[PDB]
Design an enzyme around this catalytic site. Structure first.
Site, short mmCIF file in Angstrom:
data_model
loop_
_atom_site.label_atom_id
_atom_site.label_comp_id
_atom_site.label_asym_id
_atom_site.label_seq_id
_atom_site.Cartn_x
_atom_site.Cartn_y
_atom_site.Cartn_z
N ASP A 149 1.80 7.02 -0.03
CA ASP A 149 0.75 6.16 -0.58
C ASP A 149 0.86 5.92 -2.09
O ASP A 149 0.75 6.85 -2.90
CB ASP A 149 -0.61 6.79 -0.24
CG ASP A 149 -1.72 5.76 -0.11
OD1 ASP A 149 -1.60 4.85 0.74
OD2 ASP A 149 -2.72 5.89 -0.85
N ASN B 272 -2.04 -10.56 17.32
CA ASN B 272 -1.17 -10.48 16.14
C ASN B 272 -0.01 -9.58 16.52
O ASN B 272 0.00 -9.02 17.62
CB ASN B 272 -1.96 -9.99 14.90
CG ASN B 272 -2.10 -8.48 14.83
OD1 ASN B 272 -2.07 -7.77 15.83
ND2 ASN B 272 -2.29 -7.98 13.61
N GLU C 16 -5.44 -7.91 5.39
CA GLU C 16 -5.56 -7.32 6.71
C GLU C 16 -6.52 -6.15 6.61
O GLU C 16 -6.18 -5.09 6.08
CB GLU C 16 -4.22 -6.80 7.25
CG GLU C 16 -4.38 -6.24 8.67
CD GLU C 16 -3.47 -5.07 8.98
OE1 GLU C 16 -2.91 -4.46 8.03
OE2 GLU C 16 -3.32 -4.73 10.17
N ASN D 197 0.81 -1.22 0.00
CA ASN D 197 0.00 0.00 0.00
C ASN D 197 0.84 1.27 0.00
O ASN D 197 0.43 2.32 -0.50
CB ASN D 197 -0.91 0.03 1.23
CG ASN D 197 -1.56 1.39 1.45
OD1 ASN D 197 -2.45 1.78 0.72
ND2 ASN D 197 -1.09 2.11 2.47
N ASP E 72 -0.88 -6.56 3.62
CA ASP E 72 -0.81 -5.57 4.67
C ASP E 72 -1.62 -4.32 4.33
O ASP E 72 -1.63 -3.86 3.19
CB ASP E 72 0.66 -5.17 4.89
CG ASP E 72 0.83 -4.13 5.97
OD1 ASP E 72 0.60 -4.47 7.15
OD2 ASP E 72 1.18 -2.98 5.65
N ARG F 245 -0.09 -12.24 2.84
CA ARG F 245 -0.88 -11.49 3.80
C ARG F 245 -0.80 -10.11 3.16
O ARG F 245 0.30 -9.59 2.99
CB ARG F 245 -0.19 -11.42 5.17
CG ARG F 245 -0.78 -10.34 6.07
CD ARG F 245 0.02 -10.12 7.33
NE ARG F 245 -0.63 -9.17 8.23
CZ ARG F 245 -0.34 -7.87 8.32
NH1 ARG F 245 0.61 -7.33 7.57
NH2 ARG F 245 -1.01 -7.11 9.17
N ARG G 277 -4.35 -18.96 12.85
CA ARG G 277 -2.96 -18.52 12.83
C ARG G 277 -2.47 -18.40 14.26
O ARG G 277 -3.09 -17.73 15.09
CB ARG G 277 -2.79 -17.17 12.12
CG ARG G 277 -1.33 -16.70 12.09
CD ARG G 277 -1.18 -15.34 11.39
NE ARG G 277 -1.87 -14.28 12.13
CZ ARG G 277 -2.17 -13.09 11.62
NH1 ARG G 277 -1.84 -12.80 10.37
NH2 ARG G 277 -2.81 -12.20 12.36
N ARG H 20 -8.31 5.49 1.74
CA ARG H 20 -7.62 4.79 0.65
C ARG H 20 -6.61 5.64 -0.12
O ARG H 20 -5.56 5.14 -0.52
CB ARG H 20 -8.65 4.25 -0.36
CG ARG H 20 -9.22 2.87 -0.07
CD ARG H 20 -10.02 2.81 1.22
NE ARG H 20 -10.70 1.52 1.38
CZ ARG H 20 -11.89 1.22 0.86
NH1 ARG H 20 -12.56 2.11 0.15
NH2 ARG H 20 -12.41 0.01 1.05
N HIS I 48 -6.68 0.15 3.47
CA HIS I 48 -6.19 1.37 2.86
C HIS I 48 -6.00 1.31 1.35
O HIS I 48 -5.42 2.22 0.74
CB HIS I 48 -4.89 1.76 3.57
CG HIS I 48 -5.08 1.95 5.04
ND1 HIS I 48 -5.66 3.08 5.57
CD2 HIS I 48 -4.83 1.13 6.08
CE1 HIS I 48 -5.76 2.95 6.88
NE2 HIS I 48 -5.27 1.77 7.22
O1 LIG Z 1 -4.12 1.11 13.11
C1 LIG Z 1 -3.83 1.94 11.99
C2 LIG Z 1 -3.31 1.11 10.79
N1 LIG Z 1 -1.94 0.65 11.14
C3 LIG Z 1 -1.50 -0.53 10.54
N2 LIG Z 1 -0.26 -1.00 10.90
O2 LIG Z 1 0.50 -0.30 11.70
C4 LIG Z 1 -2.37 -1.42 9.63
O3 LIG Z 1 -1.73 -2.00 8.49
C5 LIG Z 1 -3.71 -0.77 9.24
O4 LIG Z 1 -4.60 -1.81 8.83
C6 LIG Z 1 -4.31 -0.04 10.43
O5 LIG Z 1 -5.59 0.52 10.10
CA LIG Z 2 -3.68 3.77 -0.07
CL LIG Z 3 -2.70 -9.62 10.62
#
Ligand SMILES: OC[C@H]1N/C(=N\O)[C@H](O)[C@@H](O)[C@@H]1O
Ligand SMILES: [Ca+2]
Ligand SMILES: [Cl-]
Ligand SMILES: *[C@@H]1O[C@H](CO)[C@@H](O)[C@H](O)[C@H]1NC(C)=O
Length: 496
Positions: free
Chosen positions: A167, A298, A233, A100, A197, A195, A337, A158, A201
């Protein structure tokens, strides 16, 4: 796309958080394969920013600099070696794909990366990929700060920067191609899935476009037509415009409501009781079982960095944690998991851990290897929850009862419950402040079974508690609220 691609009979994956590739390769061969674990989720294998203030935090690995397989866990050769050895022993590898974003927009330009690659956040320059200013959503984001400011606006969630992380413009074919090129390289190496991540977003449609560019799994290890296992996620605890169901077309989703609710129930917060778990699953408003990836804690929320809050149970709460993990592994809902962590000096101040940034065990930044003690536990500060007898034996329990229906449920209207899985397994829990001593219908064939929580079945004998099931399938269970592990589990393979 919703299938884990694990070897038939292996039903769980374990997150060997921050482990080195060489250590994971050994673990696949000496432990994971023999004990029936289905696979391993590895930390991001691509080059990230080397952050020295604070000193090499675990979260620096979520700030990409390039897609080179070069990190504190090892290089590309070591990575390929690990995947090959693990696959040859029937243990799959799932990659944590950080697609992302790239690193923080405020990070200093230079070569402070895990592989020496040059990058310049300020001018949006990542020559090792390569990406330029045209590849980010700076012009698309509409917030005044350029970061995500309001989670009630599905658009900025997003198109804007998650806490400053640059981003990626995932709508562009070029960007989608560089990401797919990276993922296909891993697929051809032998990984079984990913996975994704921070999927919340990313637009579901952008993810789909990327997935449409992926190859089938390596035909040297998988049957023709195998598609990579995808779990996204997405943190959806309700109350937001974004729903995890919007992502079902791409693969499974992380069900964060699972651990959050299980934690409050086991801690017995605000009137919750284990007897309420009779209809656990979709009955609690969770996503469909076949679209869920479940877990107790997690890497983010075991240190208060994700979602779930203070209810989340972790290895720090050993006794209750083993119970939560046991219930999860015994219950048919979702794909499970298991977490495997490292200890850090938790320093609470005003209800918050100021050392929540601390990275893995290390010597001047170099991650320490996982040492195995004579009792099979780990040294060098690795917790190795997956090696705890109570957890390892429940991983096997899940394999043994795979496919069997949820039945023979019992509860005392409070916190003493029990249930079986077909005629292959039975489990009993006592989370009340008094003892449990009752004869229950187990649905298991007559015989003497070894309790797999208190002991093991070694050479025709039990090292712990023994249960006797009569011809009618009944057996007496006695669990003191003072027991180290207040629950008992027996299955077809622990039968004498
Ligand atoms: O908690 C904020 C944001 N932080 C994240 N990791 O640090 C996550 O990937 C994302 O899904 C989550 O919304
Ligand atoms: Ca994004
Ligand atoms: Cl996760
Ligand atoms: C089971 O353990 C007992 C000692 O407690 C021993 O006499 C017996 O031989 C063991 N059975 C097997 C099959 O090894």
């Amino acid at each position: 796309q919703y299938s884990p691609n694990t070897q038939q009979g292996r039903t769980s994956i374990v997150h060997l958080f921050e482990w080195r590739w060489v250590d994971i390769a050994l673990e696949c061969e000496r432990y994971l394969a023999p004990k029936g674990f289905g696979g391993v989720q590895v930390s991001p294998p691509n080059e990230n920013v080397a952050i020295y203030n604070p000193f090499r935090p675990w979260w620096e690995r979520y700030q990409p600099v390039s897609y080179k397989l070069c990190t504190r866990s090892g290089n590309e050769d070591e990575f390929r070696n690990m995947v090959t050895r693990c696959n040859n022993v029937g243990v799959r590898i799932y990659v944590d794909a950080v697609i992302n974003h790239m690193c923080g927009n405020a990070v200093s330009a230079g070569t402070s990366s895990t592989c020496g690659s040059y990058f310049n956040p300020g001018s949006r320059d990542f020559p090792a990929v390569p990406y330029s200013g045209w590849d980010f959503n700076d012009g698309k984001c509409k917030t005044g700060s350029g970061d995500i400011e309001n989670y009630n606006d599905a658009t900025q969630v997003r198109d804007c920067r998650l806490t400053g992380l640059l981003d990626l413009a995932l709508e562009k074919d070029y960007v989608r191609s560089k990401i797919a090129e990276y993922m296909n390289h891993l697929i051809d190496i032998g990984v079984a899935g990913f996975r994704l991540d921070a999927s919340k977003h990313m637009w579901p449609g952008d993810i789909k476009a990327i997935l449409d560019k992926l190859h089938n799994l390596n035909s040297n290890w998988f049957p023709a037509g195998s598609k990579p296992f995808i779990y996204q996620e997405v943190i959806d605890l309700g109350g937001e415009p974004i729903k995890s169901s919007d992502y079902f077309g791409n693969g499974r989703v992380t069900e964060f409501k699972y651990g959050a609710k299980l934690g409050t129930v086991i801690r017995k917060w605000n009137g919750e009781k284990m007897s309420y778990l009779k209809n656990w699953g979709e009955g609690w408003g969770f996503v469909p079982s076949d679209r869920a990836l479940v877990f107790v804690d997690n890497h983010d929320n075991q240190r208060g960095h994700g979602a779930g809050g203070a209810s989340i149970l972790t290895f720090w709460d050993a006794r209750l944690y083993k119970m939560a993990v046991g219930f999860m592994l015994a219950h048919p809902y979702g794909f499970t998991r298991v977490m495997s962590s490292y200890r850090w000096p938790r320093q609470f101040q005003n209800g918050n851990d100021v050392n929540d940034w601390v990275g893995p065990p290390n010597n001047n930044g170099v991650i320490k290897e996982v040492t195995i003690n004579p009792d099979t536990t780990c040294g060098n500060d690795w917790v190795c929850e997956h090696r705890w007898r109570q957890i390892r034996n429940m991983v096997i329990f899940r394999n043994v009862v795979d496919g069997q229906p949820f039945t023979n449920w019992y509860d005392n209207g409070s916190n003493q419950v029990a249930f079986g899985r077909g005629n292959r397994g039975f489990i009993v829990f006592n989370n009340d402040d008094w003892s449990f001593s009752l004869t229950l219908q187990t649905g298991l064939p007559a015989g003497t079974y070894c309790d797999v929580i208190s002991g093991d079945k070694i050479n025709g004998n039990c090292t712990g508690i023994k249960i006797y099931v009569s011809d009618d399938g009944k057996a007496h269970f006695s669990i003191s609220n003072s027991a180290e592990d207040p629950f008992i589990a027996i299955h077809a393979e622990s039968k004498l």
